[PDB]
Design a protein around this ligand. Structure first.
Ligand SMILES: [Zn+2]
Ligand SMILES: [Zn+2]
Lengths: 44, 69, 49, 304, 49, 58, 287, 98
């Protein structure tokens, strides 16, 4: 589950050559969610 | 946006005094000058932080794309 | 002290938590765009259609 | 003629108050050159421990990453700077952070909606779970041999209720923070002092007698514990020349253009050191006379 | 200006090692006043500047 | 149109969001106001450019 | 972090400009002290914007689109993701398995923005970040096309955030026309300090005032400071003062009831030499 | 490389000499200048930062003879060490009184 619907906020996954839409409602905008990864900052 | 830790002109820790300030204006009906004096904010650089903070993060947080609405 | 405004805290802060479910606060800001809003509305509704 | 015993005969200290956070004391018959040098080390050169490298793993909250890392830099940590040493910048990032020069903090908080909230509520502490992230949510993780020397005193923030961040359900923050030493001249977060500054002792020079009902208005032109009237004869005198900020309120009146002038005692200092929590201001001033002593001791040994 | 103040303003502006002086040694003037304690003048600052 | 500032936040817009403008290709365009002659009022006008309509023009 | 001003009109709270804070209150000392702020410039306390004074970001968004070079029902030759060829494994650090970058990652010049496999060349090309200034990736939008034929994505919107910490040469301004770039972030131990313990976080030259004749900034200094001591906001909508009741008489007596002086001056010391300065220094909090 | 005698401004006699200390400021420069101006053999003295953005500190010493400027600087560093020792003891004498 890597993507979030912009309308109903359902965490979905989008396979290859797949229709870019949410399954719970036909909304055509998807938000790429933030997956757990190391990001480094200097606290200044 | 959210309350500034460590006020800009001297360095007094100020960020732990926002929720104590709204408590001392709503339940205890004080004016803004008595409440800044009860929290220990004496210097007028320290006073204009909690006095003039807008707390705009409470308006940002109502746009949550990670939850149904 | 006569020439003092007020920091409207606990009114600014209360309005940030929940927006008004009735009409909007600050109606004078809505009147600044009424020559734009009211000019698009005149060409679809009003007298004579 | 000057000598270090002549200065020892004339210098004294009159301490006014102690506290866990704020000291107030006096330096008598010392130069403005030296009293500034103590004032400039307590702000800029006495070390303290603050979070410098923050390692984010997930941050889906509204406050972004470098701002929330900058706030973790600014929270004071109640930890003794004498317990751990300095880092070396020439070392790479694998060997630079050891257990003798780095204290590790962690912040793993998840927000979710509270089903036990009352109906028609507004208070987000009732309405949400873990909606407010404070400074005491930064958890100390002892690594290596520092789980014995810090077991007597765990690393806690000196002001635990600092509102770091705010969340809504779905959102989460997961980070690791490495807090090392540093002086206040590098960043402001390494200064262990709210403010450390002096004011010279005000000298209120009464030139003419202020008998009568002029003393009831000469008293009003100062803070109330400064000018008192004598009970025997009506005559204004100085009770406490420390309680006044130098307002020059008497200089606004044509009655007192000659009866008083406001001087300043030349070598009398009033330090007011307000600590940020980690060290006592007894110790911050004690470390400042040691830095300036070791600063001249360093140049005395260097080859010219 | 006293003797510590007067000689501080000269080396703060001349600085012989960067090549502003022409003597390889900063020369000064006798003070304006000799008693009770020696004082200089801001005329006498720019004289030796 | 008649949304409360509560319902304008639930529809992602902004709480006290004033309208007025056109969204065209993602860019918020708006047509400016122009100050122009009053309607339905014959005003007496002297212009030197009225003489350049030809000869004998005042 | 924006702030509401001590000194504001009564129309400020009527249009709801607290919803949009466009500045911040700053302890401004009108003093020739530094030498670095003479003609039109200004300086900041260095430890002020180590604490976030005047900090802001910049949000930049560009649309990477893979379908602006074709027409009319041909096979889509460019697909997001990684193909099966020998593409270099260097850019797993920036990009996900979808050929799209991760949220929050740090991108300088030359790093890839997206990976796409090309069918007419049988090669995974990458577009790259064509900007000399570093940025962080905040959000990635999957703009899906609307048609009866359901289509693989060709359009991606990516938003960058750029840390605009206030460097020198950045223009600040008052609410009176007193602009000017920053000359130096002057350190705290080198700034003047008052008897109350504070230090100013802005120094402005007194030689910016006589030719410009902005006495609204002088009286904002008395009004701003006397409101910071009492916890009150004094209104500043124009023509609430006559020539009889000067505001310098009004805000002076508010400063005189707190302990400060009627003229808004404070006895300050130097940071370098530490000596008592000659005259008391004109200070205050303006916005 | 901390202390450095600037040889383009020193003297053959050793009486006049310019020094240069790295990573110092007004904290040490003003404090050391006061102590060496208490030496009754020093003719001229002053400190000067060339540029504030560069952590560099020049100190000039000129004297009336019979002592080099290096021997003056070692005395002023010794007595600024001793001045910090008598203000540290008397602070401890009064912090234990309370
Ligand atoms: Zn959906
Ligand atoms: Zn402050």
């Amino acid at each position: 589950l890597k993507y979030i619907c912009a309308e109903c906020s359902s965490k979905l996954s989008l396979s290859r050559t797949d229709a870019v839409r949410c399954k719970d409602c036909g909304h055509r905008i998807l938000l790429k969610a933030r997956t757990k990864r190391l990001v480094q900052f200097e606290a200044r | 946006m959210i309350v500034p830790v460590r006020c800009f002109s001297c360095g007094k820790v100020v960020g732990d005094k926002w929720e104590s300030y709204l408590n001392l204006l709503q339940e205890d009906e004080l004016d803004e000058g008595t409440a800044l004096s009860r929290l220990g904010l004496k210097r007028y650089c320290c006073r204009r932080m909690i006095l003039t903070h807008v707390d705009l993060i409470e308006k940002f947080l109502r746009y949550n794309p990670l939850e149904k609405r | 002290q006569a020439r003092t405004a007020d920091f409207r805290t606990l009114e600014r802060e209360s309005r940030f938590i929940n927006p008004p479910k009735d009409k909007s606060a600050f109606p004078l800001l809505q009147e600044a765009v009424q020559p734009h809003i009211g000019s698009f509305n005149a060409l679809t509704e009003g007298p004579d259609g | 003629e000057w000598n270090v015993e002549k200065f020892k005969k004339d210098f004294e200290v009159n301490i006014s108050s102690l506290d866990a956070r704020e000291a107030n004391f006096d330096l008598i018959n010392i130069d403005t050159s030296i009293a500034n040098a103590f004032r400039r080390i307590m702000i800029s050169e006495v070390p303290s421990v603050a979070a410098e490298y923050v390692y984010f793993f997930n941050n889906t909250s509204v406050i972004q990453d470098e701002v929330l890392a900058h706030r973790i830099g600014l929270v004071p940590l109640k930890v003794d700077p004498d317990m751990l040493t300095w880092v070396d910048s020439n070392l790479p990032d694998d060997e630079k952070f050891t257990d003798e020069n780095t204290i590790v903090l962690s912040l793993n908080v998840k927000c979710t909606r509270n089903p036990d909230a009352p109906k028609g509520s507004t208070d987000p502490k009732e309405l949400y779970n873990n909606a407010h992230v404070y400074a005491r949510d930064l958890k100390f993780e002892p690594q290596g041999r520092q789980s014995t020397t810090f077991a007597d005193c765990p690393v806690v923030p000196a002001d635990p209720d600092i509102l770091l961040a705010k969340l809504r359900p779905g959102q989460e923050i997961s980070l690791k923070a490495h807090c090392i030493l540093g002086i206040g001249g590098d960043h402001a977060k390494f200064s262990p002092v709210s403010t450390a500054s002096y004011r010279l002792l005000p000298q209120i020079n009464i030139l003419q007698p202020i008998k009568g009902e002029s003393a009831r208005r000469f008293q009003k032109c100062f803070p109330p514990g400064v000018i008192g009237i004598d009970e025997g004869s009506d005559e204004a005198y100085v009770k406490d020349a420390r309680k006044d900020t130098v307002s020059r309120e008497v200089l606004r009146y044509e009655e007192f253009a000659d009866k008083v002038k406001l001087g300043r005692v030349r070598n009398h200092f009033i330090f007011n050191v307000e600590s940020a929590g980690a060290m006592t201001p007894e110790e911050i001033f004690f470390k400042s006379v040691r830095i300036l002593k070791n600063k001249a001791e360093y140049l005395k040994n260097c080859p010219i | 200006f006293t003797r510590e103040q007067y000689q501080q303003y000269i080396y703060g502006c001349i600085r012989p090692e960067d090549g502003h002086t022409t003597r390889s040694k900063i020369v000064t003037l006798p003070p304006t006043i000799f008693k009770p304690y020696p004082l200089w003048t801001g005329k006498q600052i720019i004289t030796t500047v | 149109n008649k949304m409360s500032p509560y319902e304008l936040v639930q529809h992602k817009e902004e709480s006290d969001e004033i309208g007025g403008y056109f969204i065209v290709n993602g860019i918020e365009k708006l047509i400016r106001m122009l100050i122009v002659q009053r309607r339905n009022h014959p005003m007496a006008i002297i212009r030197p450019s009225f003489a350049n309509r030809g000869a004998s023009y005042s | 972090t924006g702030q509401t001003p001590i000194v504001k009109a009564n129309l400020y709270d009527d249009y709801g400009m607290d919803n949009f804070p466009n500045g911040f209150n700053a302890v401004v000392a009108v003093i020739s002290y530094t030498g670095y702020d003479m003609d039109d410039a200004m300086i900041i306390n260095k430890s002020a914007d180590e604490r976030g004074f005047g900090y802001g970001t910049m949000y930049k968004t560009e649309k990477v689109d893979l379908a602006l070079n074709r027409n009319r029902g041909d096979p889509i030759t460019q697909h997001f993701g990684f193909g099966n060829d020998e593409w270099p494994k260097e850019w797993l650090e920036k990009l996900d398995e979808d050929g799209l970058p991760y949220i929050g990652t740090y991108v300088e010049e030359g790093d890839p923005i997206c990976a796409y496999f090309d069918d007419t060349l049988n090669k995974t090309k990458i577009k790259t970040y064509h900007s000399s200034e570093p940025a962080y990736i905040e959000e990635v939008n999957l703009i899906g096309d609307e048609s009866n034929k359901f289509q693989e994505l060709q359009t991606v919107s990516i938003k960058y955030r750029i840390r605009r910490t206030p460097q020198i040469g950045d223009k600040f301004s008052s609410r009176h026309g007193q602009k000017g770039v920053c000359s130096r972030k002057w350190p705290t131990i080198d700034m003047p300090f008052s008897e109350t313990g504070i230090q100013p976080d802005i120094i402005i030259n007194p030689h910016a005032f006589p030719s410009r004749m902005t006495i609204g900034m002088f009286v904002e200094s008395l009004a701003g400071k006397a409101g910071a001591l009492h916890g009150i906001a004094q209104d500043s909508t124009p023509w609430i003062f006559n020539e009889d009741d000067t505001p310098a008489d009004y805000f002076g007596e508010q400063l005189a009831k707190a302990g400060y002086n009627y003229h808004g001056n404070e006895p300050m010391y130097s940071g370098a030499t530490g000596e008592e300065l000659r005259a008391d220094i004109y200070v205050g909090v303006v916005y | 490389e901390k202390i450095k005698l600037l040889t383009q401004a020193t003297s053959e006699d050793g009486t006049s000499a310019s020094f240069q200390i790295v990573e110092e400021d007004h904290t040490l420069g003003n404090a050391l200048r006061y102590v060496i101006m208490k030496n009754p053999d020093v003719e001229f003295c002053g400190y000067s930062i060339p540029h504030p953005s560069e952590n560099l500190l020049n100190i000039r010493i000129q004297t009336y003879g019979e002592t080099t400027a290096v021997d003056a600087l070692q005395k002023g560093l010794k007595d600024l060490m001793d001045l910090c020792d008598v203000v540290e003891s008397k602070f401890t004498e009064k912090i234990k009184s309370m």
